[PDB]
Design an enzyme around this catalytic site. Structure first.
Site, PDB file in Angstrom:
ATOM      1  N   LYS D  69       0.804  -1.213   0.000  1.00  0.00           N
ATOM      2  CA  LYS D  69       0.000   0.000   0.000  1.00  0.00           C
ATOM      3  C   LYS D  69       0.841   1.268   0.000  1.00  0.00           C
ATOM      4  CE  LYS D  69      -3.839  -2.210   2.378  1.00  0.00           C
ATOM      5  NZ  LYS D  69      -4.640  -2.259   1.122  1.00  0.00           N
ATOM      6  N   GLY D 141     -12.234  -3.196   8.478  1.00  0.00           N
ATOM      7  CA  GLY D 141     -11.994  -3.671   9.835  1.00  0.00           C
ATOM      8  C   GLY D 141     -13.236  -3.775  10.696  1.00  0.00           C
ATOM      9  N   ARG D 153     -23.022  -3.436  -5.983  1.00  0.00           N
ATOM     10  CA  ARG D 153     -24.311  -3.255  -6.639  1.00  0.00           C
ATOM     11  C   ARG D 153     -24.381  -1.918  -7.365  1.00  0.00           C
ATOM     12  NH1 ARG D 153     -28.103  -6.979  -6.540  1.00  0.00           N
ATOM     13  NH2 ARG D 153     -28.289  -8.413  -4.756  1.00  0.00           N
ATOM     14  N   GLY D 202     -14.883  -6.135   4.788  1.00  0.00           N
ATOM     15  CA  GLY D 202     -15.834  -6.861   5.619  1.00  0.00           C
ATOM     16  C   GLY D 202     -16.029  -8.317   5.246  1.00  0.00           C
ATOM     17  N   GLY D 223      -8.812  -8.882   4.831  1.00  0.00           N
ATOM     18  CA  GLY D 223      -7.946  -8.176   5.773  1.00  0.00           C
ATOM     19  C   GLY D 223      -7.680  -8.953   7.048  1.00  0.00           C
TER      20      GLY D 223
END
Lengths: 256, 255, 263, 256, 263
Positions: D69, D141, D153, D202, D223
Site C-alpha cells: 500500500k 476492519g 451493486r 468486511g 484483511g
C-alpha cells in the site's frame, strides 16, 4: 377482455390524433389522414363535451372518435360509453373531478387512454385499465415540446434501465416507482410498455412530431392554414426518418 | 478526421462578423457590409425558421448561411442539414427543446456552433461534436457585460490549464465536469481546439474590437443598419487600430 | 405452484410456538415443552456482527429434534441462504435481528425450494416480502428487550389495514396499493381473502404467557420466542406453549402463569 | 500500449483471493492456503507505506505476486515501492490520506496500480489516472459486508444502465458521474469495467466471499484458525456457485 | 537593501533539513546527520503556554554546533524577538506552533537585522509575511501529528496560485491581489519571477524520507522536521537529509528508508 382493448389500440400505431371542436374540423382532420379525432367543445371548469356535438362528429367521419372525461369522473365515462365512442381519454387537460382516484377502467367496455409523466404513473394507469398511454408534456397550449421530451425520455429511459436490471433488484425498483410489480416484470420481459404509447403536449410542427417518433413513441396527439399543417404532421409521423420529406412538409407553413 | 474537417470549415471564418438576418434584404445588406456569414431566423416559443425563408436567403448571398436549431431538437437539425445549410447553431436563444441533452452533433455532416459560458460547457459541447464555440453573454439587451465575463472565464481557465501541474489536471477535469482528453488537448494547444466567437450585446465598434482584443476569433451581431454593420466589420478587421475605431465610430447614430 | 406448496407447508405451524436455541440441550427442552419448531442460532447487549450460524451447530440441532428446524440468514445474503438450503433446514428466516447484509434488496426467495420467513412492521412491508417469495410472515416488534409494545403496534397495524382493505370501495384500492407501496394483485388477494395470504406470527418481546396469548387474541397464528433468558426455561416454555393453545381461556392462563419464576 | 499490458497483468489474478499479511509467516500461510497474492503491511495513528525491509522479506518468502500500500496521493511512496520490485501498488484509502484533492498519477509508473472505489464514476476516474485494477471498497476492519454489497451493486448497476442507454444520453450521464466520456463509452461497449474488479471490506466468511463473486466481482481482498479460514475463503471464491462445497468449507470454521 | 541581504542569506539553506532540538546532544546529532541548521526549543499533547525558549539553553546549543541556529518567537511578540536578536541567533522563527501573543498583528520584522522565517498556509499569507519583512517562508501543514496531508495542501496551494499568477492576463492581476489580500507590487514580483521571491520550505508532519522527498518534488527548497519522536533518531535524521539531497532518486530513497525503525 383487457387484451382485446390493448389489441384495438394498436391499430393506432403510426398515426396522429387531432383535437377537433366541430364536424368541420373533424372532416379536415380525417381528409388530412388523421388516424382518429378527439372531440372537445374547447380558465373556467372544463368538462366532458356535449353529447350532441359528439354525435355530430361521430356521424361526420369514419375514423375512430375519442372524447374526454375528467379524471375520476366515472359517470362522465358511462355517458361516453353509452353514446358509443371508440375511445375515452381520462384527461388531465380537463378539470380533475377526483384528486385521489382515477376511473376504474376495467368496469368499461370502451378502451381508455390515460396520461403519464413517468413509468410509474404509466404502469398505475394501465393496472387501473388504461389500454393506451399518452406521454403528456404541457397541459396548456404552449407550443413547447420541452416537457413532452422530458417525459418521453423519462419513460423510455426507465424502460431501458428495467430491461437490463438484475431480476433480484426489480422488486425494489417497483417499490421506488410505486408500480405493480407484475406489470413491471411484464414491461421488463417485453422491453417496452405493454400498451401503445403516444406523445402529446406542445407538438406544433412536423419536426416536433418526427422527433417524438424518433424518440420511440407509437404516434402523436395534436391540439393560420390548418389543413396544410395537418397533412404535414401526418406525413411527418409517417416518414419520421426521412429528412427530405420533413423539409418538404415544413416548407411554407404560414405560421405555427 | 471528419471532425477535423468540420473544425476546418469553421476556421475559414476566423476574423469575421456573423450577422442575424430575417429576409433577403437584410442578408444582402449584411453581405454588402462584409459579414463573413449570415444567421437566418424569423425573429412565445421560438423555433427553427421556415425552410422557405432560409432557402430564399441561401440563394440571395454568396457567404456561408447559418441557421438556429433548438437545443436538443435533433430533427430540426436534420431538416437544416437536408436544406444544405453551411452551419447549424444549436442555440439557447431559441426555446430549449431538451433540458437534459444536447444534439448528438457527431451524427451530422454539417458543422455545428454551440454556446457556452465557461470552459466546461465549451468542452462538453465540443465532445458532443460542436465544431465551433460562441461564448455567449446577454441576448437582446445591448449590454456587453456578460459576454465579457464569459470570454474572461474561458480564456482565464485556459491560461490556468496551460501552466497547471499535470498531476492536478484530472481533478481539474472533474471540477470542470469536462472530458479529460479534451482538457489535455486544450492544455497542449494553449487554446480552445475549435474556433471561438463572442456573442451577446455586441452593439458598437468598440464592443466588437474589445472582444477581439480579449482573444475572440470573431463576433456575432443580432439608426443606420448598413453603416453600423460596416463599422462593426471594420472594427473586427482592425481591432487594434484606435484611429480606425475612432473613424468608424464617429457619427454612428442611435444604437 | 411451488409457492402454493411452500405456503401450504407453513400452515402446519398454526397454533405453534417457535423457540430460539443455541445448542442441543435447549432444542430438546424446546421440543419437550411442545414447541412447534426451533430456530437455531449461536446480540443487542453484545454488539459485533451477527451472521448466519455455523452449519455444524445447525446440523447438531437438526439431529437432536424431530420438529422442524429453522435458521437465520442475514437480510439480502442469498449465499447464506443457499448454504442453509444445502444443509437441509426446514425454513429459512431472512432475519432483521441479524446484521443487514444488503440495505436495498432482500433475498430473492423464489429462487429457493425451501420456505422463507420474513419480518415485517406493517402491511405493505409484509406484502412486499411475500411477493419476493416469503411463505411466512412474522410481524416483529423490538428484539431482546422483553417489551411487547412494538409487536402490539405492528400486529394492530397490519390487521388494522387488512380490515380497512376488506371493506374498501374497489375503485379506491389502486390508490391504497400505491400508498402501501405494495403489489396491487397481492393487495386485492388480501382484500378478497380477508387476511394475509400466508401464515402470520408475532415476534419481539414476548416474555410471558399473557404476552403470547395476547398476540393470539389480536389475531396471530402463533409466536416466536427468544425463554432461556429467564429463571426456569422448561416451565416457562411449557407455559407459553400452553398459553398459545389455550389463548382464549383465562383460567388456564392463570394456571400456567402461576409460579413461573423471574421472567 | 503499456496500460493494456498492466491491465493484462491484473487479469491473471481473476478468480483469486488476496490476503493481508504483516510477517513472512502469514505470507506463507496465505500462499499455502492458495491465495493468488499477498498484501504486505505492518498493520489510531497515521498509517503509511510499510518498511521496505519487511516488504523485501515477504517478496522473498513467497512465489506469488506481492502487493503493498501507498497512501493516497503519495507518489514518492509509490516510487519507492516500484523501485523495490513490488508486483502491484495499492493506492489505498485504508492508509492515511496524504493528499486530499489529487491521487497519484499512476501512468508515470511501470508497476500496475490497484485503487478503491464506491461507485462507477469513482472507478472510472481512478482508471483514467492509470489504475489497472479496481477494488470496490465497503468499510474496513468491521467484518460487515453491507457497504461492499452497496458499492458492488452500485457499480454493476450503473454499468447495466450504461450498457442499454440511448447513445445521445451518454454525454449527460458522463457529466453526472463526473467521469471521462471516452472511458464511459468504452465501459458501455465492453458491458463491464475495462479492468479487473475485486471486492474488499468486511469479507469475513466463505459465504461473504462467494456472495461477492455471485454479484460479479472478479475476486476478493481479505484483511479463530487463520490457516483453515484462509483455505475456506479461497475455496469459496473458486466454487462460489457450489452450495454443497460452500457448506463443507464453512462447517466448523470457528469464531470470525 | 538590508532586506535583499537577509533574503540572500537564506539562500544557503536550499536543499537543507532544519531540525528541532531541545538540548545539546540532539543539536550535535542533528549536525552529525547533516542538518543544514537547528531550531532550538525547550506542545500539542501537553498544553500550557508555549513561549520563547530560555536563552541559557539557546546559548548552549549555539555553542554545541557550527551550523546556523534558529529560535522561535511567539507571533507578534517583538520583544521575544529583540531578545533572540541580542543573543545572536542566526534566524528567528516567528512561529505559530508557539502560543500566539498578538491575534491581529505580526512582528514588524524589518525593524530587525536578523532574518525571519514565517509560516504560511497559502500564497496571500506568504506575501503578507514577506512584506512584513520575512526573509524565508515555510508553508506549515499541521504540527505534531506526523500527518503530512496539510503540508501537501498548502504546498500545492501556494505553488498552484503561483502558476496561475505566472500566466495571468496582466490586467487581471490587480483583482487577483485584492482577492489574495496581498500587496500588488509583491504579487507582480512573484509573477515576473515565477516563484516566491524568498526561500520556501515545507513543514508539518514530515515523518519519513518519502515525506521529505515528496515535498521537494512538489517544489520546496527544503523541509523542517520536529525525528527525535521516533525509534532511532540519528539514522532517521540522516535518512531524511539524504532524502532531501536525493529527492528525485527512488533507488536511494529505498536505500535510506530501509530498516528505519518505528517512525
Amino acid at each position: 377482455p383487457f387484451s382485446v382493448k390493448v389489441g384495438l389500440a394498436q391499430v393506432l400505431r403510426g398515426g396522429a390524433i387531432v383535437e377537433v371542436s366541430s364536424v368541420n374540423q373533424a372532416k379536415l382532420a380525417e381528409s388530412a389522414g388523421a388516424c382518429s379525432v378527439i372531440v372537445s367543445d374547447p380558465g373556467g371548469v372544463r368538462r366532458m363535451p356535449d353529447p350532441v356535438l359528439i354525435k355530430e362528429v361521430k356521424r361526420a367521419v369514419s375514423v375512430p372518435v375519442m372524447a374526454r372525461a375528467r379524471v375520476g369522473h366515472f359517470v362522465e365515462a358511462q355517458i361516453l360509453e353509452s353514446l358509443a365512442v371508440d375511445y375515452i381519454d381520462e384527461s388531465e387537460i380537463i378539470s380533475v373531478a377526483d384528486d385521489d382516484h382515477f376511473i376504474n377502467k376495467h368496469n368499461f367496455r370502451s378502451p381508455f387512454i390515460c396520461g403519464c409523466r413517468d413509468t410509474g404513473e404509466a404502469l398505475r394507469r394501465i393496472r387501473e385499465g388504461a389500454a393506451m398511454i399518452r406521454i403528456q408534456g404541457d397541459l396548456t397550449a404552449t407550443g413547447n415540446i420541452a416537457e413532452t421530451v422530458k417525459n418521453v425520455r423519462s419513460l423510455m429511459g426507465e424502460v431501458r434501465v428495467l430491461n437490463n436490471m438484475d431480476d433480484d433488484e426489480v422488486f425494489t425498483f417497483a417499490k421506488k416507482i410505486s408500480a405493480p410489480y407484475d406489470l413491471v416484470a411484464q414491461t421488463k420481459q417485453m422491453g417496452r410498455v405493454p400498451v401503445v404509447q403516444f406523445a402529446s403536449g406542445g407538438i406544433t410542427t412536423p419536426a416536433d412530431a418526427a422527433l417524438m417518433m424518433q424518440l420511440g413513441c407509437d404516434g402523436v396527439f395534436v391540439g393560420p392554414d390548418p389543413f396544410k399543417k395537418l397533412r404535414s404532421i401526418v406525413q411527418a409521423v409517417q416518414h419520421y426518418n426521412d429528412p427530405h420529406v420533413l423539409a418538404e412538409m415544413s416548407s411554407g407553413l404560414e405560421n405555427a | 478526421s471528419p471532425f477535423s474537417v468540420k473544425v476546418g470549415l469553421a476556421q475559414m471564418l476566423r476574423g469575421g462578423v456573423i450577422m442575424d438576418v430575417v429576409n433577403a434584404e437584410q442578408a444582402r445588406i449584411a453581405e454588402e457590409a462584409g459579414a463573413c456569414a449570415v444567421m437566418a431566423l424569423e425573429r412565445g416559443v421560438a423555433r427553427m425558421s421556415d425552410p422557405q425563408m432560409i432557402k430564399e436567403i441561401k440563394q440571395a448571398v454568396t457567404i456561408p448561411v447559418m441557421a438556429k436549431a433548438r437545443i436538443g431538437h435533433f430533427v430540426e437539425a436534420q431538416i437544416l442539414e437536408a436544406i444544405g445549410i453551411d452551419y447549424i447553431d444549436e442555440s439557447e436563444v431559441l426555446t430549449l427543446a431538451d433540458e437534459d441533452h444536447h444534439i448528438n452533433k457527431h451524427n451530422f455532416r454539417i458543422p455545428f456552433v454551440c454556446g457556452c459560458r465557461n470552459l466546461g460547457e465549451a468542452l462538453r459541447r465540443i465532445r458532443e461534436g460542436a465544431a465551433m464555440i460562441r461564448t455567449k453573454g446577454e441576448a437582446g439587451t445591448g449590454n456587453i457585460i456578460e459576454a465579457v465575463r464569459h470570454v474572461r472565464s474561458v480564456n482565464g481557465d485556459i491560461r490556468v490549464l496551460r501552466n497547471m501541474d499535470d498531476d492536478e489536471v484530472f481533478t481539474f477535469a472533474k471540477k470542470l465536469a469536462a472530458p479529460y482528453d479534451l482538457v489535455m488537448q486544450t492544455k497542449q494547444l494553449g487554446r480552445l481546439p475549435v474556433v471561438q466567437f463572442a456573442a451577446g450585446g455586441v452593439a458598437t465598434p468598440a464592443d466588437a474590437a474589445l472582444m477581439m482584443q480579449l482573444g475572440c476569433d470573431g463576433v456575432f451581431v443580432g439608426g443606420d443598419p448598413a453603416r453600423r454593420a460596416r463599422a462593426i466589420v471594420q472594427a473586427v478587421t482592425h481591432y487594434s487600430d484606435p484611429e480606425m475605431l475612432v473613424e468608424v465610430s464617429c457619427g454612428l447614430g442611435e444604437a
